[PDB]
């Protein structure tokens, strides 16, 4: 690690640097069909399977920053992909458990789901994506009583959320609100953050294929560079 340069850089030099290895996950111990940290998934909703997504590629980032429920080919598109990120570095690939905070990141736009003070869901950037705003949690039931804080296991853990079969409810960590549809109106139905929540707020989890996750990440990393190129040419 080259300290002398103004920006910290990694390079192969004669001077030595101490590196610590942190176990992210163990592939063999992973359980098939159970949610683990760092999975790209789609938040299927309703029995019609409308997925939580952002508006289509209409070139307006402020328009893309909104979040709504939509059904159709968006459930097959790459615009409805979210990557679950735990708030801990070590054992970040362990099985997710009921009541564990995490961050939802829109893979295509590279933005984190979050809650503004006016009780609205808006995507914002890495620089201003604080934990309190961007913390979310899956709860088994609409029950008000919580599990508080529990000791974290230094391992892959036990399986508690299963793809498709399990039904989950998104709850904000600090405000305790519940994610639900606006119900006021393809369908373009708004998703709003509510402490009561509707009696049908169940969410299904569908895992995304590796090829599609890679393609979405490539799309994001390419659009970023090409936007920089276009801005430079415009200047």
């Amino acid at each position: 690690l080259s300290y002398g340069n103004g920006s910290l850089h990694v390079d192969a030099a004669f001077q030595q640097t101490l590196w610590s290895v942190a176990p992210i996950s163990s592939g063999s111990e992973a359980a098939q069909g159970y949610l683990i940290g760092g999975d790209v998934l789609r938040l299927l909703h309703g029995h019609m399977d409308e997925c939580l997504t952002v508006p289509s590629g209409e070139h307006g980032e402020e328009q893309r920053r909104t979040v709504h429920y939509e059904g159709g080919a968006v459930s097959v598109h790459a615009r409805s992909l979210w990557r679950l990120e735990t708030l801990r570095v070590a054992w970040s690939g362990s099985h997710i458990r009921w009541g564990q905070p995490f961050r939802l990141r829109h893979v295509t736009t590279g933005k984190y789901l979050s809650l503004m003070e006016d009780k609205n869901l808006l995507l914002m950037d890495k620089e201003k994506a604080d934990v309190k705003s961007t913390a979310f949690t899956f709860r088994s039931s609409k029950e008000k009583l919580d599990v508080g804080v529990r000791k974290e296991v230094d391992g892959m853990g036990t399986s508690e959320i299963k793809y498709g079969d399990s039904v989950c409810y998104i709850q904000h960590v600090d405000t305790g609100l519940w994610l639900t549809y606006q119900s006021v109106d393809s369908i373009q139905r708004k998703a709003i953050m509510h402490h009561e929540g509707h009696m049908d707020d169940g969410i299904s989890l569908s895992r995304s294929q590796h090829e599609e996750s890679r393609t979405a990440r490539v799309i994001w990393s390419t659009v970023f560079l090409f936007n920089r190129f276009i801005r430079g040419l415009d200047a």
Binding site: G4, A13, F14, Q15
Partner: protein
């Protein structure tokens, strides 16, 4: 012997000298012109 000596020298890079330390190193050629200048100057060459 050569393989051990080279490894020890690269493990401890300060043995090469200020020209070849790596950071702010003027280089071997520049160090040798500096040596010419020092040898030409009386004050730097001698104890004075």
């Amino acid at each position: 012997n050569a393989n051990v000596v080279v490894r020890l020298l690269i493990r401890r890079p300060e043995c090469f000298g200020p020209a070849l330390r790596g950071e702010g190193g003027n280089g071997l050629l520049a160090a040798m012109e500096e040596a010419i200048k020092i040898a030409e100057d009386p004050s730097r060459d001698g104890p004075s």
